[PDB]
Design an enzyme around this catalytic site. Structure first.
Site, PDB file in Angstrom:
ATOM      1  N   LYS A   1       0.822  -1.207   0.000  1.00  0.00           N
ATOM      2  CA  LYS A   1       0.000   0.000   0.000  1.00  0.00           C
ATOM      3  C   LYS A   1       0.858   1.259   0.000  1.00  0.00           C
ATOM      4  O   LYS A   1       0.589   2.200  -0.756  1.00  0.00           O
ATOM      5  CB  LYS A   1      -0.934  -0.006   1.208  1.00  0.00           C
ATOM      6  CG  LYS A   1      -2.063  -1.012   1.115  1.00  0.00           C
ATOM      7  CD  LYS A   1      -2.526  -1.442   2.496  1.00  0.00           C
ATOM      8  CE  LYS A   1      -3.005  -0.255   3.312  1.00  0.00           C
ATOM      9  NZ  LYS A   1      -3.637  -0.684   4.590  1.00  0.00           N
TER      10      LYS A   1
ATOM     11  N   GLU B   1       2.381   7.399  11.425  1.00  0.00           N
ATOM     12  CA  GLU B   1       3.524   7.030  10.605  1.00  0.00           C
ATOM     13  C   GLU B   1       4.639   6.488  11.483  1.00  0.00           C
ATOM     14  O   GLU B   1       5.057   7.141  12.444  1.00  0.00           O
ATOM     15  CB  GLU B   1       4.025   8.233   9.807  1.00  0.00           C
ATOM     16  CG  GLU B   1       4.955   7.859   8.668  1.00  0.00           C
ATOM     17  CD  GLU B   1       4.218   7.206   7.517  1.00  0.00           C
ATOM     18  OE1 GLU B   1       3.037   7.540   7.310  1.00  0.00           O
ATOM     19  OE2 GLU B   1       4.807   6.350   6.827  1.00  0.00           O
ATOM     20  N   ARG B   2       5.117   5.293  11.159  1.00  0.00           N
ATOM     21  CA  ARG B   2       6.262   4.744  11.867  1.00  0.00           C
ATOM     22  C   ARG B   2       7.504   5.562  11.549  1.00  0.00           C
ATOM     23  O   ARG B   2       7.724   5.966  10.404  1.00  0.00           O
ATOM     24  CB  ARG B   2       6.468   3.282  11.482  1.00  0.00           C
ATOM     25  CG  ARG B   2       5.260   2.409  11.753  1.00  0.00           C
ATOM     26  CD  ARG B   2       5.402   1.044  11.110  1.00  0.00           C
ATOM     27  NE  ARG B   2       4.160   0.285  11.179  1.00  0.00           N
ATOM     28  CZ  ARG B   2       3.157   0.413  10.322  1.00  0.00           C
ATOM     29  NH1 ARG B   2       3.217   1.259   9.307  1.00  0.00           N
ATOM     30  NH2 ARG B   2       2.064  -0.325  10.488  1.00  0.00           N
TER      31      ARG B   2
END
Ligand SMILES: Nc1ncnc2c1ncn2[C@@H]1O[C@H](COP(=O)(O)OP(=O)(O)OP(=O)(O)O)[C@@H](O)[C@H]1O
Ligand SMILES: Nc1ncnc2c1ncn2[C@@H]1O[C@H](COP(=O)(O)OP(=O)(O)O)[C@@H](O)[C@H]1O
Ligand SMILES: [Mg+2]
Ligand SMILES: [Mg+2]
Lengths: 471, 520, 48, 471
Positions: free
Chosen positions: A159, A185-186
């Site tokens: 994705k 968000e990592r």
């Protein structure tokens, strides 16, 4: 409103601030607690609990704050920079640049996070297709201008790769900007990898990174930050929308926006609703995705990525997301295991704009017949795997051959992202997709073996490779 | 002059005119209510959030029991007791220490079992240290990090070949009851004997006997030369269990930013195992509910995704500008009847880069590592693997996927055609290959050699129930008859075209020599 | 005959799996809603 | 009498008592309410609410109490007698003898209920197998010395009978003493059927009752009594642990302890956790279990019965104990209804001590092979349900016969089961049972039919029965 209050309560990431009886901060008014030097903690006022007491969410560490600390009311919601100065920069929820470059500057216009959506008169009555370059996306589940598209899939189906290749496609081939809201968000997945991917994609003397804005509500941030990052990116994109440009906002995970809202509501003491979710789920989704519209002046198309909890599409978070969706693009791990990078399931990807009178009369015949052929192949796949293609009669062997050809033909190399299976850039238009799939649907490709259709172009690349190999 | 003269010269400065004998109205608090590990203090306005308070010794109590001031309510400070709640009484004095919680960090914590506060519990003397690192800190950030490239060799063939773990990658180990999550973590720790990586084991909410057995296993294999064992056991208060993983990751961040001298080499890579984040979340839920904070789903507080995320986002892979070190996180989650969709499992799954699913069905079926390859993912992928493993394990992944597609035909393989039976037999041999005994990690060269033998047509002759034995014997062969093959495989494991004709021919000769001289 | 009957049985089993998955999703959502409602009732009756 | 306060509130089994501000009782203190009959009601403090007011769990009826009653603080937690005076007596949560014998004198040592568990450096990691008289327990899930072992099953599967059979076996054939914690003990299971069953002669004039301690936190007791009865029994057993003796502790039920904790927390107004359970479930379970450890001086080795409703092992009561176990014995109703009264399932009965490095290589080999043949029979019985055994078998006849013989041989007549059956009890050493199963595993039992393996001791008893029949 220069009103100064004092911190009264600190419970986790939820604080209370006592102000004078007059000049009390309003709801979503972004109070600020100085912490020494230039550092400050920006909280967002959520409730007014009586005589000058406001309850706010911390949106920061709040692990060294004492009661009685001075609090400055800003008189407006969180102010983020807008304009061309935000292009090529990476921002947090407060609009502070979190990249190596310096501050934006006081001469840049700042806008509040909480705006109103475009009015009733400003909406565009007639929909319009948004060309994106991808074959399967432009054909099966076409985008709509000023509309919402959701991409699904597993943990590693690709994705984010699709998101970044769409960013590259929007930035390079056309002179349009995009804003990426990395909600949840990592700090490894996006805070360096996506920057490297965007700075690696280069057109001339500038990168794709130079034509996109990034707002990163990282997972390490408190729920208020991850709640307001989507609206921060909306604020940064509405400037370019007001210039008449066609912005394509990307949202990393709208479900993490939902979870941030639910955590914020739980922290404020509100009663839970549905599956432990916030009571204000519908209104919180509306305040975000009703600003993504096609205004008469400009337009904001958006592409969300949705995490479906327990594969339950009736779960309240996907249920509320689906109410605002204009198109869906379903990614399957099974297609990914067959080395198909655009692992879009054409039988599970839908779009409201797929109508004869909007995207073209030939569009809603070619797409319909391609879906019919693929459905026939899905029906016959178990029989073929069990028995074999010899049992299949005529009009079914040919249908299966054409279905395999189109199923392998939906793949693209994404040569803009890195250079995996690199080739001259194509950016296949919508009309070219329609013509190629009408060509293959009307024969004209049966002599091609079912191995040439892989990371190909517009069915003219297919015949070119066929002539090059052996003809 | 004499060195004692220098010692006296160090004195006679603070001794004579270095002490301030000024009495000052220090602000202390009085205890107004004690709950179930939560004490409320009346006036302590000079306290910050999450500050450690003292509870100074009183009559009948010669030791001070510290607490963590969590709820700074209007004219009230609710602080969770780190020690035992029985001794704290109403009206007790409480002095604000002025400090956030900090733990000793550095070389001195290597082979020591410590409290979450850094106090040793191994009974091997005081911890020697010169620097204390704060419990809570912000993650390295955006520009600080670097793409994960160096692999973490767990020693398990299935993990190191199909679910790669790299330095700086948060890889969750999620299972149920007794599936070997602690076994996988301990096997990963034991495999870093000479890999230049410092291991940390946190063990939130476990037994004292279980942590003692883990420490004994580590020290009987020599792993305590580079391992730190934090410990917040089940009997200890929920505050200690709540602060244990943050103490562990503070030590890990000390290793990452500065490094320690391990085997005479500077090491800046740390591998941390939070052996129960489900128990950590349970402890924090108890803390929040005892503080009367509003509950959420499954009675967890609102900031429980935040809770773990602060912990896990601190595991980074820094670029060369910021030192180049890394911190690798291995959180462990225990599900209930494989309820992956529970609150804490979904939180940690979303936070972490990859997942390692352990199934009780595979554990009771003889699969010694009960690893579910189909659903477990590592989104870092081939970047967290050596080039040799990248070249070899691709066909293993493809064949295992093909076998999992055809797993319903396994008992019926004698009645199918040639190609389906061949695929089923290959998948069965590969699955038998992935079975590994406990406390027996394999080096990367051994894994590469075994997977090259299996990937090519060499295990077709040997029957399925002997595959594992074959592997063991082959390794012994490579450990005795051909050390040069192992050294050759290890030497060019980073070559882009790994199967060079030299190493390829050497490995083929070794495999043929082993097969010709052995019968199965 | 056995091949055709077992193919039909497999298709019916897949349909039953789909229906049971819908029922299980409804049951799980109802269970979590009941749990959070009970917790909120037990918390709001003693705090505010 | 350090302090005297007055009762402020009586809400069910919750007492709010106001004490002088300088003499407030401690957190786990015991407070006595004198009644107008020469007796007293001992409540346990749980909280200190505000200025001198304490909330306490009643541990009694509280049907004779009025507001303003005098309450005497004891200064310390509940003190229960320890020593040889407690041996051969039956107690309750308060340490008062509830049998017909006289009260315990004041010369005995009384120890507080709440004590810190042994430290980390006092743990004895040396795993040693504790010899039980049960064949299946010895072979499949061996009993660990100093470890905590659990029994899981439905209702009427045999948990209490097994527990009292281990009491009788380890007191008769071994010199180990025993302490019994009837948490939520039924007045039929505890007041009878265990006192009478412990009137089994050891050598000539001493019964198993005379060498055991019993503490019954009966079901009609308030939830605090059932919550603290386990700690009372632990305090009584810790004296024998501190004397160097290897003491045995049987907690007759764990889920009733969890239920008592949940009821106590709900009555105190604590916020509910998970599905309405207590927030301190893990901490309470840890406080109970961590005192049962093997130290350098002595070792408390425990067996704890757990009742799983239906087959739900995910309920909070068995889930919170799984972390504290060294071995699990899974009782099944299907095996019990097949007249195999020690209804242990050899499958799904694990043990950490079942390792060749601890119990020996022969024990591990025999147990593993027995489990393997039983696992094969688990499918072969289904196979022979329709296709008769004589029709076709490739060594399947032999392995089915051996598996039936060993699953009948796991059955053992108990000393306390003479009331149910009349068969005299049998005790098998751990060496004799593994030797017998090794002998039966490879031949030597294929000629003896599956009727002489039903209720026997070692293989020599099976033989003696066979050649007694063939006379
Ligand atoms: N690879 C293996 N091969 C054989 N036995 C194994 C293996 N891994 C684990 N075991 C056995 O299974 C037992 C349970 O494993 P382990 O304790 O690591 O699981 P866990 O998930 O951490 O469980 P717990 O909930 O008890 O902490 C181990 O004590 C060991 O005896
Ligand atoms: N060893 C045995 N021999 C004969 N009957 C037994 C034995 N163990 C249990 N039972 C049967 O089980 C009943 C007692 O079960 P009990 O152990 O009290 O149930 P639970 O396991 O739920 O405590 C008795 O009535 C008896 O008929
Ligand atoms: Mg474990
Ligand atoms: Mg019972």
């Amino acid at each position: 409103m220069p009103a100064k209050g004092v911190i009264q309560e600190i419970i986790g990431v939820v604080i209370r601030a006592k102000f004078p009886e007059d000049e009390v901060p309003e709801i979503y008014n972004a109070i600020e607690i100085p912490l020494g030097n230039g550092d400050r903690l920006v909280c967002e006022v959520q409730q007014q609990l009586g005589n000058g007491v406001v309850k706010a969410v911390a949106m920061g560490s709040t692990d060294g704050l004492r009661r009685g600390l001075e609090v400055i009311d800003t008189g407006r919601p969180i102010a983020v920079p807008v304009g061309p100065a935000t292009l090529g920069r990476v921002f947090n929820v407060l609009g502070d640049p979190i990249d190596g470059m310096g501050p934006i500057g006081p001469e840049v216009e700042r806008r509040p996070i909480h705006r109103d959506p475009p009015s009733f008169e400003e909406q565009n009555t007639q929909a319009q297709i948004f060309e994106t370059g991808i074959k399967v996306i432009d054909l099966i589940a076409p985008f709509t201008r000023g509309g919402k598209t959701a991409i699904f899939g597993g943990a590693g189906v690709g994705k984010t790769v699709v998101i970044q290749e769409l960013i590259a496609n929007i930035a390079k081939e056309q002179s349009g900007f995009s804003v990426f809201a990395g909600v949840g968000e990592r700090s490894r997945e996006g805070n360096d990898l996506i920057h490297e991917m965007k700075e690696a994609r280069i057109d001339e003397n500038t990168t794709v990174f130079d034509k996109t804005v990034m707002v990163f509500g990282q997972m390490n941030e408190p729920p208020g930050a991850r709640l307001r990052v989507g609206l921060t990116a909306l604020t940064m994109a509405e400037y370019f929308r007001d210039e008449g440009r066609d912005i394509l906002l990307f949202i990393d995970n709208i479900f993490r926006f939902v979870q941030a809202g639910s955590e914020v509501s739980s922290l404020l003491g509100r009663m839970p609703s549905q599956v432990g979710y916030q009571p204000t789920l519908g209104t919180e989704m509306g305040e975000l995705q009703e600003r993504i519209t096609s205004t008469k002046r400009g337009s904001i198309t958006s592409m969300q990525a949705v995490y479906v909890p327990a594969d339950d599409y009736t779960d309240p978070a996907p249920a509320t997301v689906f109410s605002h969706l204009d198109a869906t693009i379903s990614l399957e791990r099974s297609i990914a295991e067959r080395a198909i990078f655009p692992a879009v399931d054409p039988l599970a990807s839908t779009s409201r704009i797929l109508d004869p009178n909007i995207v073209g009369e030939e569009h809603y015949r070619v797409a319909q017949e391609v879906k019919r052929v693929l459905q026939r192949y899905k029906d016959l796949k178990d029989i073929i795997a069990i028995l074999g293609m010899e049992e299949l009669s005529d009009e079914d062997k040919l249908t299966v051959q054409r279905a395999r050809k189109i199923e392998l033909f939906f793949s693209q190399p994404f040569t803009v992202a890195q250079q995996f299976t690199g080739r001259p850039g194509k950016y296949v238009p919508v009309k070219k997709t329609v013509e190629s799939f009408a060509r293959l649907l009307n024969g004209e490709g049966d002599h091609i073996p079912e191995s040439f259709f892989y990371m190909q172009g517009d069915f003219d690349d297919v015949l070119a490779a066929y002539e090059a190999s052996q003809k | 002059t004499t060195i004692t003269e220098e010692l006296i010269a160090r004195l006679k400065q603070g001794i004579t005119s270095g002490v301030d004998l000024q009495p000052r109205q220090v602000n202390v608090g009085t205890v107004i209510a004690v709950g179930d590990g939560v004490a409320r203090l009346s006036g302590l306005d000079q306290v910050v959030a999450s500050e450690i308070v003292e509870f100074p010794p009183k009559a009948g109590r010669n030791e001070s029991i510290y607490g963590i001031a969590l709820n700074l309510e209007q004219d009230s400070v609710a602080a969770i007791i780190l020690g035992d709640d029985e001794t704290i009484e109403e009206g007790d004095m409480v002095t604000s220490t002025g400090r956030v919680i900090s733990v000793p960090v550095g070389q001195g914590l290597l082979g020591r079992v410590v409290n979450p506060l850094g106090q040793p519990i191994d009974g091997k003397g005081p911890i020697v240290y010169e620097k204390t690192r704060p419990i809570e800190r912000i993650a390295p950030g955006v520009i600080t990090r670097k793409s994960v490239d160096t692999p973490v060799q767990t020693g398990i063939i299935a993990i190191d070949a199909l679910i790669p773990i790299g330095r700086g990658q948060r890889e969750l180990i999620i299972g149920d009851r007794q599936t070997g999550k602690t076994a996988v973590a301990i096997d990963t720790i034991l495999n870093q004997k000479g890999q230049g990586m410092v291991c940390i084991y946190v063990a939130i909410g476990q037994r004292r006997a279980q942590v003692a057995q883990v420490v004994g296993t580590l020290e009987r294999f020599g792993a305590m030369e580079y391992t730190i064992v934090v410990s917040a056991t089940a009997s200890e208060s929920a505050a200690l269990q709540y602060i244990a993983p943050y103490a562990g990751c503070a030590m890990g961040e000390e290793i990452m930013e500065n490094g320690v001298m391990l085997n005479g080499q500077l090491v800046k890579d740390a591998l941390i195992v939070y052996d129960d984040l489900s128990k950590h979340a349970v402890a924090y839920r108890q803390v929040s509910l005892l503080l009367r904070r509003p509950p959420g789903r499954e009675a967890y507080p609102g900031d429980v995704f935040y809770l773990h995320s602060r912990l896990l986002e601190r595991a980074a892979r820094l670029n060369e500008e910021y030192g180049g070190g890394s911190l690798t996180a291995l959180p462990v989650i225990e599900t209930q009847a494989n309820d992956v969709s529970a609150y804490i499992p979904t939180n940690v799954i979303s936070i972490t880069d990859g997942q390692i699913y352990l199934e009780s069905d595979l554990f009771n079926a003889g699969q010694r590592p009960a690893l579910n390859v189909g659903i477990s993912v590592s989104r870092v992928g081939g970047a967290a693997q050596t080039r040799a493993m990248r070249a070899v394990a691709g066909k293993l992944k493809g064949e295992l996927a093909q076998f999992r597609d055809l797993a319903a035909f396994a008992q019926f393989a004698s009645d199918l055609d040639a190609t389906t039976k061949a695929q089923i037999e290959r998948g069965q041999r590969l699955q038998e290959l992935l079975k590994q005994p406990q406390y027996q990690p394999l080096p990367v060269e051994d894994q590469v050699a075994v997977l090259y033998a299996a990937t090519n047509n060499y295990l077709d002759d040997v029957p399925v129930p002997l595959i594992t034995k074959w592997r063991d014997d082959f390794l012994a062969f490579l450990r005795t008859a051909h050390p040069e093959v192992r050294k050759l495989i290890y030497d060019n494991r980073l070559d882009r075209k790994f199967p060079t004709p030299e190493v390829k021919e050497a490995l083929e000769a070794a495999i043929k020599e082993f097969k010709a001289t052995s019968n199965y | 005959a056995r091949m055709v009957a077992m193919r039909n049985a497999t298709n019916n089993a897949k349909d039953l799996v789909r229906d049971l998955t819908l029922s299980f999703n409804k049951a799980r959502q109802a269970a979590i809603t009941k749990e959070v409602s009970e917790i909120a009732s037990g918390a709001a009756a003693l705090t505010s």
